[PDB]
Amino acid sequence: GAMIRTVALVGHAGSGKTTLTEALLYKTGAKERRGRVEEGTTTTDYTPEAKLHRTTVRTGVAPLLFRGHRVFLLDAPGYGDFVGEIRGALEAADAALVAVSAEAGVQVGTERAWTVAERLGLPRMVVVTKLDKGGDYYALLEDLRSTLGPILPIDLPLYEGGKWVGLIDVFHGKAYRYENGEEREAEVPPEERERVQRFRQEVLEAIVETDEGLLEKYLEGEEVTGEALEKAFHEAVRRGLLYPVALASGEREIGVLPLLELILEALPSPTERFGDGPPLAKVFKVQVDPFMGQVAYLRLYRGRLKPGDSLQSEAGQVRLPHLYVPMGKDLLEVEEAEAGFVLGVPKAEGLHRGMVLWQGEKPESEEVPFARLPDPNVPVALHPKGRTDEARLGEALRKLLEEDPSLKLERQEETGELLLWGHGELHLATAKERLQDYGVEVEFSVPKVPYRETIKKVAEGQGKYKKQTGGHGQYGDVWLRLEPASEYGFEWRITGGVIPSKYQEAIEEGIKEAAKKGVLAGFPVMGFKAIVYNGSYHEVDSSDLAFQIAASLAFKKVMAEAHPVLLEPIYRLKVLAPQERVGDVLSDLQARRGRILGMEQEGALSVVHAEVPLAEVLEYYKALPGLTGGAGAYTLEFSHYAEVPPHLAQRIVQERAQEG
Ligand SMILES: Nc1nc2c(ncn2[C@@H]2O[C@H](COP(=O)(O)OP(=O)(O)OP(=O)(O)O)[C@@H](O)[C@H]2O)c(=O)[nH]1
Ligand SMILES: [Mg+2]
């Protein structure tokens, strides 16, 4: 009676998620006509980026109304590039509907969605799409069984002359065919009956075994009622003990409403997950429309709300004079909201992704669903195209990051460049396009490498600053010795009190400042001991400034005779390529001045450890997926610095010097 469900539709790119979402919206009456991704007419993919790349860049909300029941379906993206939106959609749902292309089977995007859902403690259901494009359903079920585990087949495909035309409801022993956008009951083909009965028995047994009460009856001799089985089934799915497997296609228009009925029957309600109590909500995503402003998307996990109500938040009281349910980019006004509802809050400049909202006692960390986002690992130096852009780029980035916090903006300490980190070439491309939607043109470039300097031999020298400008003068005198070393260190070796200990901080600051720009090529210096072993001061003219200057003057003089050497960053790779996709990964590193460190070949997938310079893998994200059959992801992490091979070393030194 007036049930509610919040479900995240996830899965690998191209598994027919958005097409299924369109079919659901159309078949329920929420939409006049079902659009197509190819034509850019769907409810989910409305932003310029989504339509341009023909992929779900942003999670779309599809509020489904069916016979009084409500299913708030979140149509999430498929590519790992949009992990931010994917993980947020799962954080917002009480269960995951995982689409699996029949012709491809479980893919990388399937495993990632599945794992995040499992960690969030969410029930899982699988929907098999694209059976009309090919694939063997029965072999697919076996693969899902061996890969996912306790799957539970709900549907089997109905075939007519080799053509997929419908489905067979295993449990009820009924078949349905579709044609002209119409569902009709059909007979279970004679040749299929024995197999269908086998699946039915296995389904009955799988459900009975998860319920102690039913296992007692089945054993005691008592009868198992249909209502008893339904309850056991629902509870088993709620606890993640069974994973229903449905068959549906928005393109072929097969099993669409049946999938909705199954969602209501199999997946849990907000109450079965959080129980009843005061309002509890969370902003799981944010959209910043170029014209409409910021809109916050909230998931109400518990409680009820009416227009005029308010919620507490870390940012203070949040009034909601108007309640809106989102449907794509549109906000539909409602007169009330119950747990399970997904709401859209306009003019939400003060609400950000991750903020918890509540009434009553403030929730503690464990009471709210949370899925951490991996740090973005693809950097690109950012540059406004021109004048106006450079000026509007500040506000444009603010909006971009509010809407997509999976993107990180940083200022390289050494290089000084403004870097934007994303999760892939595609993610960054959408970021670029989005900035353009905000009226700003930018261009990317490979980040400048943060080269460093060091010394190879010991050297000593004096640094002295003595001048008199005005009333009093300044005096600083320092003797410095530089020693090559693995780690930087300041060593105060002053004796006889020739320099008071109070100038130690100033002297070190001077050494550090000068070290910001080496003598060899103007890069930061590292790996050296700075030893202050003698000097002098004047009680009258000595000061921190004088010694900082004296110390700096000494560093530059001394480093010039310590045999400078140019260093470069060196990272370690941890590639993950399939069985025969290893002879292509270890073949690529050779052109990148690499070095193998190990290879964990276990079963099918075998890890491939390595070590390679940073200057050689700045755009290795534009290659790995195209060599590991796309079923592999590269990993780059800082290891240590090293001397730039004499060849390049000289080359690089020349450039930096050439101009300034
Ligand atoms: N033959 C066939 N094609 C389908 C089916 N479902 C979707 N397609 C098509 O396959 C493509 C996948 O479409 P979407 O529905 O955009 O897929 P998605 O899984 O939502 O894709 P992403 O948002 O990129 O993760 C589209 O070009 C659809 O026209 C299906 O059941 N059968
Ligand atoms: Mg999609």
Side-chain angles (χ1 to χ4, degrees):
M3 305 185 270
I4 298 181
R5 306 281 185 272
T6 314
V7 186
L9 174 59
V10 294
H12 198 92
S15 58
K17 296 192 299 296
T18 294
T19 298
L20 224 195
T21 304
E22 272 304 291
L24 284 159
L25 288 163
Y26 171 71
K27 282 281 187 175
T28 56
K31 203 177 183 180
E32 236 304 306
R33 54 189 174 183
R34 38 183 152 189
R36 298 179 185 176
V37 173
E38 312 93 295
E39 309 180 6
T41 50
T42 66
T43 290
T44 302
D45 302 328
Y46 66 79
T47 63
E49 299 69 54
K51 299 167 70 173
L52 180 54
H53 297 278
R54 258 31 170 166
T55 188
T56 300
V57 174
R58 302 250 103 203
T59 297
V61 177
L64 304 177
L65 181 55
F66 189 55
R67 306 184 177 185
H69 309 293
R70 289 178 173 284
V71 178
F72 290 79
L73 184 71
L74 309 172
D75 179 13
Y79 292 108
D81 288 73
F82 316 114
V83 56
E85 278 290 72
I86 297 172
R87 292 194 178 192
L90 284 167
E91 276 191 328
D94 291 342
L97 175 60
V98 186
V100 171
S101 173
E103 65 182 313
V106 180
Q107 293 169 283
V108 183
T110 311
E111 309 175 65
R112 289 172 186 170
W114 194 271
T115 297
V116 173
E118 189 166 54
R119 275 56 183 174
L120 278 165
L122 306 179
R124 276 138 286 150
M125 179 184 288
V126 172
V127 56
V128 177
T129 60
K130 294 190 166 183
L131 184 54
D132 57 300
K133 275 191 173 180
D136 171 23
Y137 194 74
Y138 300 87
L140 174 58
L141 292 180
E142 291 190 3
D143 304 322
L144 292 172
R145 175 82 63 191
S146 66
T147 296
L148 305 177
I151 60 163
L152 190 80
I154 296 303
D155 303 312
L156 292 189
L158 179 60
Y159 286 103
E160 269 166 29
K163 175 183 183 180
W164 175 43
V165 301
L167 37 70
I168 299 175
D169 181 304
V170 172
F171 189 80
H172 302 292
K174 287 187 172 57
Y176 305 81
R177 70 190 303 285
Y178 301 73
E179 194 179 304
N180 301 309
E182 81 182 5
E183 185 184 67
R184 246 62 186 179
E185 175 165 43
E187 297 289 3
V188 181
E191 334 80 275
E192 307 271 1
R193 302 189 178 190
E194 300 186 309
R195 181 164 61 181
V196 174
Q197 185 178 58
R198 257 177 280 147
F199 272 92
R200 182 182 177 187
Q201 291 185 300
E202 299 182 311
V203 159
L204 291 179
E205 302 182 309
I207 295 170
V208 173
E209 289 181 356
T210 70
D211 189 288
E212 287 175 51
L214 287 190
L215 254 180
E216 286 188 299
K217 287 173 174 292
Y218 190 65
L219 301 183
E220 285 177 57
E222 294 185 297
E223 62 173 61
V224 181
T225 65
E227 301 191 3
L229 280 169
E230 295 182 60
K231 293 179 178 297
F233 170 65
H234 188 75
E235 284 305 305
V237 184
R238 178 182 75 67
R239 297 177 301 199
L241 303 180
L242 295 177
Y243 307 127
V245 177
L247 188 56
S249 163
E251 207 67 60
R252 295 302 306 171
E253 316 178 329
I254 296 170
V256 171
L257 291 178
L259 169 59
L260 193 55
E261 290 179 294
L262 178 66
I263 288 180
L264 291 172
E265 179 68 55
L267 311 181
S269 68
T271 303
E272 291 170 340
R273 185 185 183 195
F274 295 95
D276 241 294
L280 179 57
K282 184 181 180 168
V283 181
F284 69 90
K285 72 162 293 185
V286 166
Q287 284 296 305
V288 175
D289 183 69
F291 311 91
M292 188 187 274
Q294 185 161 153
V295 173
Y297 294 67
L298 318 196
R299 159 59 201 284
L300 180 64
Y301 295 112
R302 187 183 66 202
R304 289 187 171 182
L305 292 170
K306 294 203 298 177
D309 288 357
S310 291
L311 289 167
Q312 263 297 310
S313 74
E314 289 304 331
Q317 167 185 45
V318 180
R319 278 190 58 64
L320 306 171
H322 294 286
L323 301 174
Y324 303 100
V325 164
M327 177 171 80
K329 60 176 181 176
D330 292 341
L331 290 179
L332 317 179
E333 177 153 31
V334 292
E335 292 124 292
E336 182 174 52
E338 302 182 59
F341 264 64
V342 161
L343 298 174
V345 186
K347 303 181 183 301
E349 278 62 45
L351 298 178
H352 318 84
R353 178 178 193 288
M355 280 178 62
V356 181
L357 292 288
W358 69 86
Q359 280 189 182
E361 70 145 1
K362 175 185 168 186
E364 276 168 37
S365 78
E366 344 79 56
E367 303 170 356
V368 184
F370 188 92
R372 184 191 66 96
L373 290 184
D375 273 348
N377 61 314
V378 181
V380 290
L382 216 182
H383 309 289
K385 190 180 177 179
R387 180 188 179 186
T388 56
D389 300 306
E390 196 280 348
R392 306 164 63 174
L393 189 274
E395 178 63 4
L397 284 175
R398 183 189 68 64
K399 291 183 291 188
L400 203 233
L401 295 197
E402 271 302 307
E403 179 175 280
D404 186 355
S406 70
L407 287 165
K408 282 177 189 297
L409 186 75
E410 95 166 3
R411 175 72 65 184
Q412 169 61 56
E413 307 184 306
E414 299 173 52
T415 305
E417 288 189 307
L418 180 64
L419 308 180
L420 183 69
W421 298 74
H423 291 90
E425 173 167 25
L426 209 218
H427 184 203
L428 294 173
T430 62
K432 185 187 184 72
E433 291 162 42
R434 195 52 169 171
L435 279 175
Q436 186 167 65
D437 297 337
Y438 296 134
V440 181
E441 281 181 284
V442 309
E443 67 187 76
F444 304 144
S445 60
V446 180
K448 300 180 183 176
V449 177
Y451 289 113
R452 284 181 179 179
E453 290 177 45
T454 189
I455 61 178
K456 189 176 174 299
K457 72 183 177 185
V458 310
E460 307 188 310
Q462 171 183 45
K464 186 180 252 286
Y465 180 75
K466 185 170 64 181
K467 301 179 178 180
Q468 183 188 306
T469 308
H472 287 297
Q474 288 283 50
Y475 181 89
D477 183 12
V478 187
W479 281 82
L480 182 71
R481 171 177 241 255
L482 281 56
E483 300 188 316
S486 65
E487 308 273 52
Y488 159 88
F490 185 74
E491 310 189 324
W492 183 255
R493 293 296 181 281
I494 287 297
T495 65
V498 297
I499 298 182
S501 59
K502 65 180 181 180
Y503 291 127
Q504 194 178 311
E505 184 190 306
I507 288 172
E508 170 158 42
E509 304 193 318
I511 295 296
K512 290 188 179 180
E513 302 192 63
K516 292 187 301 178
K517 303 182 178 182
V519 173
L520 178 59
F523 295 90
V525 197
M526 67 182 273
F528 69 91
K529 294 303 179 186
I531 307 170
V532 181
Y533 63 99
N534 192 205
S536 61
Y537 77 106
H538 291 153
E539 191 61 62
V540 187
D541 303 314
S542 282
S543 65
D544 288 319
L545 179 278
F547 273 105
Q548 293 183 296
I549 293 177
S552 45
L553 282 174
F555 184 89
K556 295 181 177 180
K557 287 183 173 58
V558 182
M559 173 167 52
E561 299 180 358
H563 194 296
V565 177
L566 184 60
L567 307 170
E568 73 181 307
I570 286 184
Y571 287 57
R572 169 183 287 186
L573 272 171
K574 191 166 185 173
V575 182
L576 298 174
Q579 289 192 63
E580 200 171 63
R581 280 297 187 176
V582 181
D584 310 298
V585 181
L586 294 181
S587 177
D588 165 62
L589 301 181
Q590 299 185 304
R592 302 178 183 294
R593 309 180 300 172
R595 177 163 170 286
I596 299 179
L597 292 173
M599 294 172 260
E600 304 175 300
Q601 301 193 59
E602 304 176 60
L605 300 177
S606 58
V607 185
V608 178
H609 295 303
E611 203 175 69
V612 50
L614 173 67
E616 305 297 299
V617 297
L618 292 172
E619 294 191 302
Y620 179 75
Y621 61 105
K622 296 188 182 179
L624 190 288
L627 299 177
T628 55
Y634 79 85
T635 295
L636 278 172
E637 296 182 1
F638 177 68
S639 183
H640 62 283
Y641 274 76
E643 306 185 7
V644 184
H647 322 306
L648 299 174
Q650 182 180 300
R651 304 179 191 177
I652 302 168
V653 176
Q654 299 180 304
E655 300 187 303
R656 248 285 183 174
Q658 292 182 303
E659 319 175 313

